[PDB]
């Protein structure tokens, strides 16, 4: 029963393994990473504002309580 299965795994294995290594490798990966690095740059953005703001907030709180 497993013979019909585990061989069909090995069918897909080379079918995609040496196959997309060639022309659909840097078509997907380099496009993926493209929007990924763009997203990362996006995130670095918000996370900045938020920390920088929570620098400003906690600074104004020191002032307003002592005042």
């Amino acid at each position: 029963a497993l013979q019909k299965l585990l061989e069909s795994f090995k069918i897909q294995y080379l079918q995609f393994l040496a196959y997309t290594k060639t022309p659909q490798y840097k078509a997907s990966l380099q496009e993926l990473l493209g929007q990924e690095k763009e997203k990362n740059a996006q995130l670095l953005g918000a996370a900045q504002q938020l920390l920088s703001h929570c620098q400003a907030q906690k600074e104004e709180i020191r002032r307003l309580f002592q005042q």
């Binding site: 840097k26 380099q30 990473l33 918000a46 996370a47 938020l50 703001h53 929570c54 709180i61």
Partner: protein, 67 residues
């Protein structure tokens, strides 16, 4: 224990699907795409944290500024 072995598929599979992949180009393309993926996730949550920590911290600031 079925899962214990179900993840033994995903581990060894991933281990050799990468290992048999081109060790010249992928070693750079994967690592980057793994490293950034995690980093973009960690950043997401840390935003989600700082999102609230801002809000709740801004609540208090309102409080002090009122009277």
């Amino acid at each position: 224990s079925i899962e214990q072995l179900l993840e033994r598929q995903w581990s060894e599979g991933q281990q050799f699907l990468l290992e048999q992949g081109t060790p010249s180009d992928i070693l750079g393309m994967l690592k980057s795409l793994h490293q950034l993926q995690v980093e973009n996730r960690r950043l997401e949550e840390q935003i989600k944290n700082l999102t609230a920590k801002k809000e709740r911290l801004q609540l208090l600031n309102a409080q002090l500024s009122v009277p």
